[PDB]
Design a protein around this motif. Structure first.
Motif, short mmCIF file in Angstrom:
data_model
loop_
_atom_site.label_atom_id
_atom_site.label_comp_id
_atom_site.label_asym_id
_atom_site.label_seq_id
_atom_site.Cartn_x
_atom_site.Cartn_y
_atom_site.Cartn_z
N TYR B 638 0.87 -1.18 0.00
CA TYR B 638 0.00 0.00 0.00
C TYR B 638 0.89 1.20 0.00
N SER B 639 0.77 2.08 -0.99
CA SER B 639 1.59 3.30 -0.97
C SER B 639 0.91 4.48 -1.68
N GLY B 640 1.60 5.61 -1.71
CA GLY B 640 1.20 6.74 -2.50
C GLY B 640 -0.14 7.36 -2.11
N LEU B 641 -0.36 7.60 -0.81
CA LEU B 641 -1.57 8.31 -0.32
C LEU B 641 -1.72 9.68 -0.95
N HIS B 642 -2.81 9.94 -1.65
CA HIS B 642 -3.04 11.29 -2.20
C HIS B 642 -4.45 11.78 -1.73
N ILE B 643 -4.54 12.97 -1.15
CA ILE B 643 -5.83 13.52 -0.69
C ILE B 643 -6.21 14.76 -1.47
N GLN B 644 -7.48 14.89 -1.81
CA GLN B 644 -7.90 16.03 -2.59
C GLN B 644 -9.25 16.58 -2.08
N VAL B 645 -9.34 17.90 -1.90
CA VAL B 645 -10.60 18.54 -1.46
C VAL B 645 -11.49 18.68 -2.67
N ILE B 735 -14.11 14.91 0.31
CA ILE B 735 -12.69 14.63 0.07
C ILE B 735 -12.54 13.35 -0.73
N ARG B 736 -11.59 13.32 -1.66
CA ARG B 736 -11.25 12.10 -2.41
C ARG B 736 -9.93 11.62 -1.85
N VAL B 737 -9.80 10.32 -1.68
CA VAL B 737 -8.55 9.70 -1.16
C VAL B 737 -8.11 8.62 -2.19
N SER B 738 -6.80 8.51 -2.47
CA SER B 738 -6.30 7.50 -3.40
C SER B 738 -5.07 6.86 -2.82
N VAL B 739 -4.84 5.57 -3.13
CA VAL B 739 -3.57 4.94 -2.83
C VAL B 739 -3.29 3.97 -3.96
N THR B 740 -2.06 3.51 -4.04
CA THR B 740 -1.59 2.48 -4.96
C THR B 740 -1.48 1.18 -4.19
N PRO B 823 -0.09 1.75 7.35
CA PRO B 823 1.14 2.49 7.18
C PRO B 823 0.92 3.85 6.53
N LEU B 824 -0.22 4.05 5.86
CA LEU B 824 -0.44 5.32 5.23
C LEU B 824 -1.37 6.15 6.10
N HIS B 825 -0.97 7.39 6.38
CA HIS B 825 -1.82 8.34 7.09
C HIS B 825 -1.45 9.72 6.73
N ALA B 826 -2.43 10.62 6.77
CA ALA B 826 -2.26 12.07 6.63
C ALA B 826 -3.29 12.88 7.47
N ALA B 827 -2.99 14.15 7.73
CA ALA B 827 -3.98 15.09 8.27
C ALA B 827 -4.98 15.36 7.17
N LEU B 828 -6.26 15.45 7.52
CA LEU B 828 -7.26 15.91 6.51
C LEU B 828 -7.41 17.41 6.60
N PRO B 829 -7.56 18.09 5.42
CA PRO B 829 -7.81 19.53 5.38
C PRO B 829 -9.20 19.81 5.95
N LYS B 830 -9.37 21.01 6.50
CA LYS B 830 -10.61 21.41 7.11
C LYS B 830 -11.68 21.52 6.02
#
Ligand SMILES: *[C@@H]1O[C@H](CO)[C@@H](O[C@@H]2O[C@H](CO)[C@@H](O[C@@H]3O[C@H](CO[C@H]4O[C@H](CO[C@H]5O[C@H](CO)[C@@H](O)[C@H](O)[C@@H]5O[C@H]5O[C@H](CO)[C@@H](O)[C@H](O)[C@@H]5O)[C@@H](O)[C@H](O[C@H]5O[C@H](CO)[C@@H](O)[C@H](O)[C@@H]5O[C@H]5O[C@H](CO)[C@@H](O)[C@H](O)[C@@H]5O)[C@@H]4O)[C@@H](O)[C@H](O[C@H]4O[C@H](CO)[C@@H](O)[C@H](O)[C@@H]4O[C@H]4O[C@H](CO)[C@@H](O)[C@H](O)[C@@H]4O)[C@@H]3O)[C@H](O)[C@H]2NC(C)=O)[C@H](O)[C@H]1NC(C)=O
Ligand SMILES: *[C@@H]1O[C@H](CO)[C@@H](O[C@@H]2O[C@H](CO)[C@@H](O[C@@H]3O[C@H](CO[C@H]4O[C@H](CO[C@H]5O[C@H](CO)[C@@H](O)[C@H](O)[C@@H]5O[C@H]5O[C@H](CO)[C@@H](O)[C@H](O)[C@@H]5O)[C@@H](O)[C@H](O[C@H]5O[C@H](CO)[C@@H](O)[C@H](O)[C@@H]5O[C@H]5O[C@H](CO)[C@@H](O)[C@H](O)[C@@H]5O)[C@@H]4O)[C@@H](O)[C@H](O[C@H]4O[C@H](CO)[C@@H](O)[C@H](O)[C@@H]4O[C@H]4O[C@H](CO)[C@@H](O)[C@H](O)[C@@H]4O)[C@@H]3O)[C@H](O)[C@H]2NC(C)=O)[C@H](O)[C@H]1NC(C)=O
Ligand SMILES: *[C@@H]1O[C@H](CO)[C@@H](O[C@@H]2O[C@H](CO)[C@@H](O[C@@H]3O[C@H](CO[C@H]4O[C@H](CO)[C@@H](O)[C@H](O)[C@@H]4O)[C@@H](O)[C@H](O[C@H]4O[C@H](CO)[C@@H](O)[C@H](O)[C@@H]4O[C@H]4O[C@H](CO)[C@@H](O)[C@H](O)[C@@H]4O[C@H]4O[C@H](CO)[C@@H](O)[C@H](O)[C@@H]4O)[C@@H]3O)[C@H](O)[C@H]2NC(C)=O)[C@H](O)[C@H]1NC(C)=O
Ligand SMILES: *[C@@H]1O[C@H](CO)[C@@H](O[C@@H]2O[C@H](CO)[C@@H](O[C@@H]3O[C@H](CO[C@H]4O[C@H](CO)[C@@H](O)[C@H](O)[C@@H]4O)[C@@H](O)[C@H](O)[C@@H]3O)[C@H](O)[C@H]2NC(C)=O)[C@H](O)[C@H]1NC(C)=O
Ligand SMILES: *[C@@H]1O[C@H](CO)[C@@H](O)[C@H](O)[C@H]1NC(C)=O
Lengths: 834, 832
Positions: B638-645, B735-740, B823-830
């Motif tokens: 699991y890699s490449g976490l991408h978050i988009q508002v 929010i859209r979330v993506s991983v590989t 293993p993948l985590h990020a802060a979410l934008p408000k």
């Protein structure tokens, strides 16, 4: 009290017939041997001292490995990666010479590939005197003709595979009760000696001895004498059965081994015609032997003549060369005593080098095919009201009865098969083999239904009658499984001490069939059992539309049955014994109580030849299903019986030879560089003091009074009138009459017919018909074939006690041909032949 | 004592969203109905009077056949020639939306072809507050996001196949103990009313309610209200759960039926939001009803407004038309009560014509394939120390455990599966179906070995330890089968009254594993069970080389398992609950003793949202196997976490449809033979009181009718209402979330990527599940997994605002392979 007349001396081998070359080689090798070496051939090395259930020391100086003797008549006992074949009674039910041969060969290959030299089977004794005898299932049929042919074919299959076969148990071991003193004691009976079968000379020749004559003539290598007594002389020292019947009359050229614990004297047994002592000791691990040391000594002190011991050696080596065992030799590559890879070499005392005792050799090959085929071809269709074959289109199938399902302890979870749990595919005792797997009827029939997308369940608790009735009501067919078990006398299941206490279905079987028949109009009964069972309370139920007896099918049981139920195999098996209405209808009761105080119980065979169907016939009793009865999915017609008359030996033996020399007692003292293994039986003397090294309380006591007249007589002997050949005088085998009949398949599917040929020998005390010939013929719809057999002089004779010979009596004789012992539409008078 | 506030009036249907057509056709036909005809729609005809578990008499004059309602959530109960599907809990183990749907469709087809109009399932209540809860297995998961999605998928499959699905049990029926007064009595407890689930408003929204919102939004046509009380108001007359939560907030357009014996009043239930009485009588075959005649009288005498009964009849018809049942109608062609081809048409009193009652229609088609596959794709590989898949070259195979073998009474030999004998492929109670057959593990594994010419045996007595140890020393592999069973409360097995007394293996299971593992260096454990069991005393045994949990797989059990063991199927299933070290580690104890004298027991959900993994995470306990855990024969990365508002305020007035006349119109027709115990809508005479026979008839009536209960005037739309499954703004994607995801192993297989959020705040779980999928990847194969978070996904329920609120605490997003492997985590934008 019945008495057994002496017959001495113990006849010596002569290279008769087929034995010529084996005997020459045996002579040439035994000539090279010391006395202790020869003794080594005659005596087992002690209970559980080596790998096999019996094992001799061999002759290491001459590169002869110990002989390994293993049970059982239906596959290798106490081993691994071997097959479990159907029982001998199944073989009998096939009435197929070819299948008996093929099973013999498949077993022989497996025994061979384990480093086993001698198979302790097949069995033809018990013949089947009493339908409740614990061991009938190990043999074939209560009929001598059917038993003898299939016995002989089984022997030839084994021996052509390169393993010595052992015709057992010789002779008259017709029940388990009281067959052994310690065995009876454990059951609370106190007897000083073993049960005594008391039989007339005519009866013995025309029944119990007849298959043994077939075995001898087919070339059998070994015979095992029995636990019982015959006229109060033990089987393994009865000079009349051993010297006279087997060796002089039948002209037997191989060796006689004792049953395990059946050896009861050193000198007496040797002079009465025993050749080999198993397992070697007096009782298990007694570290004493009637032979070994004692036999070396008995030669040294003049009591047993060198020619007799030399003859033992020659007969043992001749059996070994005759099957070509020397060409296949390898030490046994498994242990009977443990499944461990590594262990002490000498199991019982846990001594000798610690080394590989199991190689886990896979010997099964593709033998599941013959087992599956044989199980199918031994499935007797006793009743069929247009119920069978099943089509696969049955909507909901109820499989009913514990006998359809699994043994919850695992297929091998009862030691020596000593329980009746789950499907009955193998009865109990020494006549057993470890299953590589067991396919249950539940598994096979469920898989067949699911292949056609039907609905199916198995109910396997025979007292769950409520669930049985509820399911039966919903089913399109109810397949009800029931069984009756039995086995060797050392194991008791539910109070049945080998012999069955009754002929009733076990585990509530009659109640189960009734619970089903009262609710499915299509109730189909399958019986697994060791012999006949009482079917009187349900067989004629209007809702019991078919009935099959499938015997003891071994490992492929469920697939053999499915093959029959669904029409892949048209059943062609025939009952090889009688299904009577009551126990009483068979007569021949077992001796179950002490009737000679604390002496040997006496078993008088007062019915004479009138056992099984011969008795039903004499008494005018109507069986439910008669000897020779079996249905098919087609029909057969017999027509055109014709009879054609056909155009158709030393008077003394040589003197007894000795081979090699005997030296001083000091030659046979324990060798100085040898560690004597505890409990191990050797041929050696402690010192040159013969008496002290015998350790025999009776040594030199009244010796000459205990050696019978003629017992040491090595001079030429007369040839018995009935002897002088293999399985008797060769004239007995002259073909006197040719018989032919046309058999036609008059139905719509291929199938096997089993034509059967009975004769009536005539006379106030003869059975009305006795089987003589049969074959199993595969026929396409509308196909015809002319079946042709011959009758021999033996086939037309009776035993004349005054002449001591087989005689064709002056009573007019008839031939009968048909489909069972009661369905004989063709008859013909026989012309005088002599 | 806890108290359930009133909420009135009971909202009427309004043809919302996907219901517009069905509602218009429902209004058109109900417009033509007389009062007694409408009443016939709402009331069962009495216990065992007709064919199905529940059945209404329909409206013959308008060609509407009586509605046939039949168990169970996993196949047709009480019938013949039907399939037996794996349990709900297995569907949860698959984490496979598409499998949930195909299993719904397969069931729908079977029910439809028996002439059944309404399937009494699927289940999402119990959610599974307690690991030893007796019916958790009928549902899905103690996780509300996983349950809601798979519950909605099942309902769509059933309903696209033309059968009404019934989302049950609404709500809080989280244990069997004390669920029913008569049942409790038979077990020796004296209580005056059923167990009361007492639950705060936030917890109900965030956990128990949430999968009902998904069910409603996916279009479920019926709901079944529960036997228990909530805050001491019966589930089937609770105005707060039914009127406020289900109908006003979630906007449910379908019908609510009672559980069987869960109807406890005529007027009260009607007004509090109930639409259908099952099985129709007050007690089984009492010949009396809270409705039927009583409901006709309650309308004639002005206590129940015509608009309420009209609405019941509209909800019930709208559901029937929504799935297209009218195009597929046929009378039920089997009897629940007998297998006989012929019998009296009215089973219980044995009255009416003697005629055909079973036609033996074989509806199984090819459904065994979906069953086998779902059984394989739901087998969780918990441990594999390089032991699996087997090759078929194993020289000698020991199958060990009664759980491998046959039920000696036959697969259906114990009524409603009320025993644990032989292989466990179905738990007990109403949640059951007659097997057409049962492939046991023994059968399928021995057939497999025989196909390769191996040696194989099964030992099926769990106390035959001597035989087990002897075989296990000789074996190349030992396959040890163990189980743990449970069921519905009316059946007690070995003293387990529905609920499990413990989480320990039944039938000497622990000692059986220990005896095998003490002698085979290659011991493989297979567990069939209703839920977690304690594995602590043998899971880490060095000879235990692998461990699988296979749930409750239905008729193809053995073939399902063999497919996995022999590598035909790569396991992809993931545990749908937590495997704790001890029972204590789960908290949430059942109420097992009376705690309110001889009144209703009080079951305080004092843990709040913290059930299953939420509680383990809260207490920092380490599970042996976490929620979300399952191994595969390959590995994934699991890699490449991408978050988009990313970039209605009042209802109408209550309508009435058609007309009500005088009492004399609803008196029993003269030519009709009255079947004994049969419940009818008619009056003995125009005398209302004497026709009702109610000892309370006409007494204090207005004081027993809460304020607003008869208010047919336009109502405010709730802030969190206005749509299907809640206010539509709740379903906006924020929010859209993506991983590989990559398969880095050597075996084709499915990954189950799992996305968890942390909503933040002192009272929130560390992580809660929000999205997941099951993705098939060949070796080395990669894919992008993309998913979106809704406004609901990021919200907490604010009791003050009576609405979902995205709180001001900062939120995080996590992606990985389990609730503990992220293993993948990020802060979410408000976002707001
Ligand atoms: C060189 O070395 C050699 C090796 O070391 C030395 O060999 C030893 O020689 C001894 C003789 O000197 C042997 O001891 C004697 O043996 C006999 C035979 O015993 C066995 O057979 C019995 C049946 O015998 C008949 O049949 C056999 C063939 O099957 C014949 O060979 C016999 O001749 C006899 O034949 C007649 O009958 C048959 C029909 O049945 C006819 O066809 C013939 O025509 C004849 O008429 C059998 O019954 C014995 O069974 C017993 O022993 C078993 C244990 O082995 C046990 O299982 C049985 O239950 C049974 O137990 C009972 O008896 C024994 C003792 O024998 C007790 O210990 C026990 O407690 C029980 O009571 C066995 O299988 C044996 O009969 C002799 O004993 C009799 O006579 C002595 C006195 O001389 C008495 O003390 C005894 O009580 C006994 O008496 C009975 O019989 C008498 C008949 O004469 C009668 O008068 C009495 O009333 C009484 O009832 C001796 O025991 C020894 O066996 C042998 N050792 C080995 C290893 O071979 C050799 O000596 C040495 N040479 C020299 C020169 O130094
Ligand atoms: C036109 O025809 C119609 C059709 O025939 C006629 O219909 C009948 O009308 C009658 C009224 O005239 C009805 O009889 C009364 O029923 C009520 C309600 O009973 C049921 O509900 C109870 C819970 O009630 C609350 O909640 C419901 C919704 O769930 C509301 O509708 C209620 O308004 C009430 O709401 C309050 O509470 C909730 C929260 O809980 C809030 O949200 C609200 O804001 C309110 O605060 C429930 O507990 C009842 O359960 C009993 O019944 C079950 C069997 O049905 C049983 O399993 C339960 O165990 C329980 O049993 C016990 O009680 C019953 C009596 O009901 C005993 O028989 C039994 O032995 C047990 O002891 C039920 O489901 C009911 O409360 C009334 O009875 C009370 O009042 C009378 C005096 O009038 C007393 O004699 C009683 O003892 C009883 O008193 C209790 O309550 C009192 C306060 O209410 C309190 O003062 C007492 O101290 C005491 O504790 C009546 O029985 C009848 O049901 C209805 N028939 C049908 C077929 O529908 C109609 O009359 C006619 N119209 C005209 C104009 O002619
Ligand atoms: C709520 O739901 C419930 C449950 O669904 C509904 O209750 C059911 O309602 C049905 C009415 O729709 C009622 O049906 C009746 O069944 C009787 C039994 O039928 C069986 O037995 C017979 C006799 O051997 C078989 O023929 C038949 O196939 C069945 O096996 C029938 O006898 C009734 O038939 C009569 O009415 C129908 C029309 O409904 C006519 O077609 C039929 O010809 C019969 O008509 C005669 O009887 C009626 C009586 O109304 C007269 O009006 C008419 O003129 C005929 O009368 C002649 O014959 C009678 C006697 O036969 C004689 O006395 C007279 O003098 C004349 O010579 C009818 O089919 C169900 O039984 C009933 N179910 C139960 C369990 O009670 C209920 O309606 C629903 N409520 C609402 C509001 O929708
Ligand atoms: C009758 O049968 C008896 C059983 O078959 C015969 O006894 C056996 O005789 C052989 C040949 O004499 C003996 O073999 C000897 O074994 C020892 C020990 O062997 C092991 O240990 C060594 C050392 O580490 C190892 O290298 C070997 O391979 C063995 O594993 C050897 O040291 C000797 O040189 C010799 O080979 C048996 O010991 C003996 N068996 C028993 C049970 O006593 C007997 O010879 C036969 N009698 C007649 C007259 O033929
Ligand atoms: C021979 O010697 C052994 C051991 O020295 C002794 O124990 C055994 O009993 C002896 N045999 C006899 C017959 O004395």
């Amino acid at each position: 009290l019945a008495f057994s007349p002496p017959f001495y001396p113990s006849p010596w081998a002569n290279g008769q017939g087929e034995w010529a070359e084996a005997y020459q080689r045996a002579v040439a090798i035994v000539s090279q041997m010391t006395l202790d070496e020869k003794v080594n051939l005659t005596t087992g090395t002690g209970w559980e001292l080596e790998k096999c259930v019996g094992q001799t020391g061999g002759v290491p100086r001459l590169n002869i490995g110990g002989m390994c003797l293993q049970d059982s008549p239906l596959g290798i006992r106490d081993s691994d990666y071997n097959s479990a074949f159907p029982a001998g009674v199944n073989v009998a039910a096939t009435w197929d010479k070819n299948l008996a041969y093929l099973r013999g060969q498949a077993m022989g290959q497996e025994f061979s590939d384990k480093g086993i030299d001698v198979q302790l089977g097949p069995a033809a004794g018990p013949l089947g005197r009493s339908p409740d005898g614990g061991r009938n299932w190990e043999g074939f049929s209560p009929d001598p003709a059917l038993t003898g042919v299939l016995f002989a074919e089984t022997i030839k299959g084994i021996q052509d595979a390169g393993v010595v076969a052992t015709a057992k148990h010789y002779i008259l071991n017709e029940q388990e009760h009281f067959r052994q003193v310690a065995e009876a004691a454990g059951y609370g009976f106190n007897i000083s000696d073993t049960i005594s079968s008391n039989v007339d000379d005519k009866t013995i020749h025309e029944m119990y001895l007849w298959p043994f004559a077939d075995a001898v003539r087919a070339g059998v290598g070994a015979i095992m004498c029995s636990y019982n007594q015959i006229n109060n002389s033990y089987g393994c020292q009865n000079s009349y059965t051993l010297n006279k019947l087997l060796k002089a009359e039948l002209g037997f050229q191989g060796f006689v081994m004792s049953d395990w614990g059946a050896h009861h004297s050193g000198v007496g047994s040797a002079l009465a015609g025993l050749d080999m002592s198993m397992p070697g000791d007096i009782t298990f691990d007694s570290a004493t032997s009637f032979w070994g040391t004692n036999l070396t000594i008995a030669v040294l002190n003049g009591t047993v003549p060198q020619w007799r011991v030399d003859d033992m050696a020659v007969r043992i080596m001749a059996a070994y060369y005759k099957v070509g065992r020397d060409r296949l030799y390898q030490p046994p590559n498994f242990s009977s005593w443990t499944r461990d890879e590594y262990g002490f070499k000498y199991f019982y005392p846990q001594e000798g080098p610690y080394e590989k005792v199991n190689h886990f050799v896979n010997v099964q090959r593709n033998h599941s095919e013959v087992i599956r085929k044989l199980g199918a071809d031994s499935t007797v269709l006793l009743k069929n009201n247009n119920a069978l074959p099943l089509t696969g289109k049955e909507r909901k199938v109820a499989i009913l009865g514990e006998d359809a399902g699994s043994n919850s302890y695992g297929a091998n979870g009862c030691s020596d098969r000593g329980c009746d749990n789950g499907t009955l595919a193998m009865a109990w005792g020494s006549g057993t083999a470890e299953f590589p797997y067991l396919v249950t009827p539940e598994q096979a029939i469920q898989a067949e239904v699911l292949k056609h997308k039907g609905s199916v369940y198995a109910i396997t608790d025979n007292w769950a009658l409520s669930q049985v009735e509820t399911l039966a009501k919903q089913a399109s067919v109810s397949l009800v499984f029931v069984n009756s078990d039995a086995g060797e006398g050392y194991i008791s299941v539910d109070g049945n001490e080998g012999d069955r206490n009754n002929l009733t279905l076990w585990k509530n079987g009659d109640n189960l069939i009734k619970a089903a028949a009262n609710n499915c109009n299509n109730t189909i009964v399958v019986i697994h059992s060791v012999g006949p069972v009482l079917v009187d309370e349900w067989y004629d139920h209007p809702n019991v539309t078919a009935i099959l007896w499938a015997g003891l099918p071994g490992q492929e049981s469920g697939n053999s049955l499915a093959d029959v139920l669904y029409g892949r195999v048209n059943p062609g098996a025939k009952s090889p014994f009688t299904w009577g209405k009551t126990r009483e209808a068979y007569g021949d009761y077992l001796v179950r109580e002490l009737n000679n105080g604390n002496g040997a119980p006496q078993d008088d065979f007062s019915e004479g030849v009138f056992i099984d169907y011969r008795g039903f016939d004499k008494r005018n009793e109507t069986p439910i299903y008669e000897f020779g009865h079996g249905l098919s999915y087609t029909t057969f017609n017999y027509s055109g019986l014709h009879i054609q008359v056909l155009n158709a030996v030393a008077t003394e033996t040589g003197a007894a030879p000795t081979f090699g020399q005997v030296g001083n007692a000091s030659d046979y003292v324990y060798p100085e560089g040898l560690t004597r293994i505890s409990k191990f039986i050797y041929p050696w003397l402690n010192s040159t003091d013969l008496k002290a090294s015998s350790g025999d309380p009776y040594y030199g006591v009244d010796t000459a009074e205990h050696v019978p007249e003629g017992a040491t007589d090595g001079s030429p002997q007369p040839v018995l009138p009935a002897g002088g050949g293999s399985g008797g005088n060769p004239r007995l085998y002259d073909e006197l009459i040719r018989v032919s009949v046309t058999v036609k398949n008059t139905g719509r599917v291929a199938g096997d017919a089993v034509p059967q040929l009975y004769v009536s020998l005539g006379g106030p005390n003869e059975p009305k018909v006795v089987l003589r010939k049969f074959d199993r013929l595969t026929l396409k719809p509308s196909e015809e074939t002319v079946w042709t057999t011959t009758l021999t002089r033996r086939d037309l004779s009776n035993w004349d006690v005054a002449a001591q010979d087989w005689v064709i009596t002056s009573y007019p004789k008839k031939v009968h041909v048909g489909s069972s012992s009661r369905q004989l539409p063709l008859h013909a008078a026989l012309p005088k032949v002599q």
